[PDB]
């Protein structure tokens, strides 16, 4: 889990979702691409 101020898509499979007032980058191809805004 990468916790950063600047969260973004790093691929075409990476997806931006907001959960419980948190912007997150969930990915179906690469676990390295999983990010949380914080």
Partner RNA sequence: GCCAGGAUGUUGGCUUAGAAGCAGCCAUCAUUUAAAGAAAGCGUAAUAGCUCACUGGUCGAGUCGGCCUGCGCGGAAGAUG
Partner RNA sequence: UCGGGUAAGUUCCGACCUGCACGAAUGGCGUAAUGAUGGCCAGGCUGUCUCCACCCGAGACUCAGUGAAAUUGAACUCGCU
Partner RNA sequence: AAGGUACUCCGGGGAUAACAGGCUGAUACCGCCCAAGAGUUCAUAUCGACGGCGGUGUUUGGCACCUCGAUGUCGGCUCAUCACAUCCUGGGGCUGAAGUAGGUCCCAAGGGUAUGGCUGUUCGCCAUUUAAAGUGGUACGCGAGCUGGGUUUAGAACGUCGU
Residues interacting with RNA, by CB under 7 A? 1-6, 8, 10-12, 21-23, 29-32, 34, 37-38
**Shortest approach of RNA to residue 25 CB, angstroms?**
11
Binding partner selected for residue 27 from Zn ion, RNA, none, CB under the kind-specific 5 to 8 Å limit: Zn ion
Distance CA 13, CA 21 (A): 22
In a 3-state reduction of DSSP, which class is residue 33?
Answer: helix
**Shortest approach of Zn ion to residue 24 CB, angstroms?**
12
Distance CA 29, CA 38 (A): 23
Q: Answer yes or no whether residue 14 interacts with Zn ion by CB under 5 A.
A: yes
In a 3-state reduction of DSSP, which class is residue 30?
Answer: coil
């Amino acid at each position: 889990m990468k916790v950063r101020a600047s969260v973004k898509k790093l691929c075409r499979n990476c997806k931006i979702v907001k959960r419980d007032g948190v912007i997150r980058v969930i990915c179906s191809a690469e676990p390295k691409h999983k990010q949380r805004q914080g």
